[PDB]
Amino acid sequence: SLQEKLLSYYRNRAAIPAGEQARAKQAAVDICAELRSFLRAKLPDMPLRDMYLSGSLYDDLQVVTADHIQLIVPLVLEQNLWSCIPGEDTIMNVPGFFLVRRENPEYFPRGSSYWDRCVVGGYLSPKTVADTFEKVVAGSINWPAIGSLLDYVIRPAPEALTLEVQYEKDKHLVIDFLPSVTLGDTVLVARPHRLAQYDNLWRLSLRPAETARLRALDQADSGCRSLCLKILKAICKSTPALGHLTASQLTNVILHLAQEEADWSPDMLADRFLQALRGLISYLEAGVLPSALNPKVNLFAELTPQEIDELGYTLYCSLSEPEVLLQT
Amino acid sequence: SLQEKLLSYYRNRAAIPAGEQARAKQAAVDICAELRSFLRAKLPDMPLRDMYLSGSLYDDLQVVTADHIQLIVPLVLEQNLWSCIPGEDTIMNVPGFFLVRRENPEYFPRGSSYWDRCVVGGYLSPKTVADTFEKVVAGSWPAIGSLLDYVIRPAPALTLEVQYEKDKHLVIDFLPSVTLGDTVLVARPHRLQYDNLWRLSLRPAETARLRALDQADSGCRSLCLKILKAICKSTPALGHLTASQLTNVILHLAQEEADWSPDMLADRFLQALRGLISYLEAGVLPSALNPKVNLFAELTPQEIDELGYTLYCSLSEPEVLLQT
């Protein structure tokens, strides 16, 4: 049966071996803790708060192998000196991103905020904020040295700025930094749009609300929504042609399906999984996967029409190839 | 035998029991973490860095019972809008304390800094800072308490009384802090009244030095300190002395004596009493890190009298101080 096959798959492929999981988490926590001590007394005029961990590995949603996690770098934008403008209301015309503008320059002149140094054309540029972070914060740190204080080999990549942390003989955790600001209840991260011309836009952070929703639905049920997600994530991670699919896209297929099916008991796993499959296919066919949290946002918007067709073509072929889809 | 009484007094009175000290510290660390979450969600617009723990309980220097710790509240000041003026350069003439002045008010008007809201008469007032923090950072306690299964009671100055055990409680107080350039200041008012003055923070360097010295030696400097703290905590006539005064007595003695091996404790302990008496007779205990600061400038004449008397007498019967 498909039910057995899926549970077998989760167990032999999707589920991260516990030792691996524990050691990767420990290295992240230990590095985050050491950075907290180190940075606390270092950049006294910078509105910088403690870095903190975020991502599927932190949430028990990472699959196959523990290989990555984020350190969010929370920055403070002072009261009433800043506003965010939704992307769809800018000429850039992209929902799910925001411009951040310096407000009241005419009364609290350029110079008033620490972040004025990262202001360009009146806007707080996420790439200039990220450059400042890398040069001023990350740069003040000897990475291989901290790994030596802790007992890890830490290698900063020369390529986007990430840390490769060997936590096991032949296993490494890749850590990347996400500068973040919050305006009202709008949480923004500097993860650039795929294309350069959009590099002035901060990205709206969806993950915390997405994963909260998913968890809250399963707690109430108590359903197999997260198990289904982890399985689909493992298939995509394990299939190169499915490389363009993200955890957010898969999570939102499941959240939409949650509006249509209330019953996610353990024995419904197979039916829901197949539903999630045909559903993902139909969104690809439509070229649009609306965010379950903010339906103005199209989660496929950074993919090209050709990429979207290739994904759908791949999934259709997979239906007749359960053995490759469910390796190993 | 003095040696014996000191060693036994450390274990019998000064050393906090292990369960108590771990639970109390862990409670502080747990509340500190939740605070981070509240600031993240509820105060994204206040230029405050994350609060962090500070004090003897965090340093394994607390004695007798785990009953208090501080959370530093680190304000972020623009380097171009603020300066600190050293107390000795003021008519008030108070070394070890600073004024924090708002600079360039005509070019950058009120509002150019979040912290302008805590300015009075052109200076950043620790009072309004504490008020603001208490008013604004008071949208957050029983949820943090239920979460950690601690009962948490905020005082109606704002401090937290945390029941971490049936018959024990930890009192957490908040210490506003600003750092300008290389200078770290805390809102801990002069004990004897210039309450516009911030205090130069000496504790981190003081304790780091004491630790460094013992670490190199496996010496008994910290042991001697904790015994002295316990005695003062236990002896009303001696309660006027602070951990910092006692720590600095020890730092100065460490400059004079190289041997702090375990059996030197009794001798170093007596030297510390006699040191106290000599600084008392001078009315001056300079900070070992910043000798222009007189740590005894915060003691009253009546306190200096009682301390001196109590200590002179004790020198003939040191063990009287080692009451069970």
Ligand SMILES: Nc1ncnc2c1ncn2[C@@H]1O[C@H](COP(=O)(O)OP(=O)(O)O)[C@@H](O)[C@H]1O
């Ligand atoms: N707080 C956050 N806000 C926005 N994006 C985040 C946050 N934390 C992690 N991410 C992003 O989430 C993505 C990783 O998704 P994740 O849920 O970890 O699934 P996966 O296990 O497939 O990596 C990355 O693009 C990363 O930048």
Ligand SMILES: Nc1ncnc2c1ncn2[C@@H]1O[C@H](COP(=O)(O)OP(=O)(O)O)[C@@H](O)[C@H]1O
């Ligand atoms: N970072 C700091 N800078 C300056 N003073 C501090 C700091 N942290 C704590 N203090 C002060 O230290 C005093 C407590 O001293 P501590 O070393 O904890 O000894 P004790 O155990 O006797 O309380 C309090 O007045 C508190 O405000």
